[PDB]
Structure 1
Amino acid sequence: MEYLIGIQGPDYVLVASDRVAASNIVQMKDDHDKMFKMSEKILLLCVGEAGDTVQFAEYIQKNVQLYKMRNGYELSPTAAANFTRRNLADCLRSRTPYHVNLLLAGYDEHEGPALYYMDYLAALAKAPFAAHGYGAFLTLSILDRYYTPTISRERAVELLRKCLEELQKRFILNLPTFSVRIIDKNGIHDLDNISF
């Protein structure tokens, strides 16, 4: 299983993904990227069955870039979320269902930061903070404890580090490294990968 996390702040959204992709017993790649850039201020996260994640993320990415090229302005994160939800829901009852779990995080000039959650059933909900994977069961309580609507981004980083420390301490699957990125009105900005 793969671990995802999202934290919404007043002026920012913080996301992390584990960067391990694996076979049954052995981890082939220690630097896999589960973060996909739909647009300048929008990030799509995907975890789930092999292949389906990649194909779906790519399709959504291309349709978003297409909207940008056609119309000259990037989509709202809300809109991209609803578009993703539409596609995934259509695929659900199709012959080929994509089994994926998503976080769509982005910043809007008008509406500011947002964080969305989508399960493989393609139900959508906007939350202040969210996670996917087995680790989410562990870290959501941490988030509930130390969250505030007014978190400063450094404090959010410290919080995230606490959650990953919980993972390393308890969660059976080795998750050595998590890549981190922050969304801002300025744009997406990378950060030093939290590692152990």
Structure 2
Amino acid sequence: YLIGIQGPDYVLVASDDKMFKMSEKILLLCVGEAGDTVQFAEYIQKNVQLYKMRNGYELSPTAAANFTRRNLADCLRSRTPYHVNLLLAGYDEHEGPALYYMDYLAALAKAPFAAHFLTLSILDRYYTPTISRERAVELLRKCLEELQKRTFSVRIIDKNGIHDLDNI
């Protein structure tokens, strides 16, 4: 249950925590094999820290997403039992908010909204680019209720930066 809702100036994730931040303005949500997921998260976090502090500027959410897709493809390719699904919520200084859906096979896809089916169906029923934070929290609550009928702790990556929001 990792529900993400991209918005005008934020990206409200909702983990089941799974929220392993890579750097400022970047938040990666990893789900799958317990051992592989955290190891991959740590590896990518170290790589992005290296890039940040070697170049003086951090990888943008798009660049981080692409690099993570490449690395995840390699990792699955190096060892088959590396079933690791990702959800990279982040904010870009120029681009703005950026949510990124990616399956275990490292198929990156920018997502107006994402989840890792019942949760996605509720988002499909109701979603708007011009959405507010409280509206996204309500959406997450509805998706969680639908999934239960069939946690949701949320953070946002705002232009200010990563924030901790009331757990749902």
Common topology (TM > 0.5)? yes
1:73-112 Cα offsets, whole Å, 9 max, x none, are 1110000011111111112222455210000010011000
Q: CA deviation at 1:167?
A: 2.2
Structure of higher RCO (CA pairs closer than 8 Å, 6+ residues apart): 2
1:10-65 Cα offsets, whole Å, 9 max, x none, are 11110011xxxxxxxxxxxxxxx211111111100000012000110000001011
Given that 2:8 and 2:129 are in contact with CA atoms closer than 8 Å, whether structure 1 keeps it comes out as yes
What are the ranges of 5 or more consecutive residues in structure 1 without an aligned counterpart? 18-32, 171-176
How many residues of Structure 1 are paired with residues of Structure 2 in the alignment? 167
SS at match of 1:183: strand
Distance 2:12 2:55 in 1: 28
Larger Rg: 1
What are the ranges of 5 or more consecutive residues in structure 2 without an aligned counterpart? none
Q: Which has the higher helix share?
A: 2
With the length of structure 2 as denominator, give the TM-score of the two structures: 0.95
Alignment-derived partner of residue 30 in structure 1: none
Going from structure 1 to structure 2, the CA distance change for 1:147 and 1:93 (only over 3 Å counts) comes to same
Given that 2:140 and 2:152 are in contact with CA atoms closer than 8 Å, whether structure 1 keeps it comes out as no
Q: CA deviation at 1:187?
A: 0.2
Distance 2:102 2:125 in 1: 23
Which structure 1 residue ranges, 4+ long, deviate > 6 Å from structure 2?
none
With the length of structure 1 as denominator, give the TM-score of the two structures: 0.82
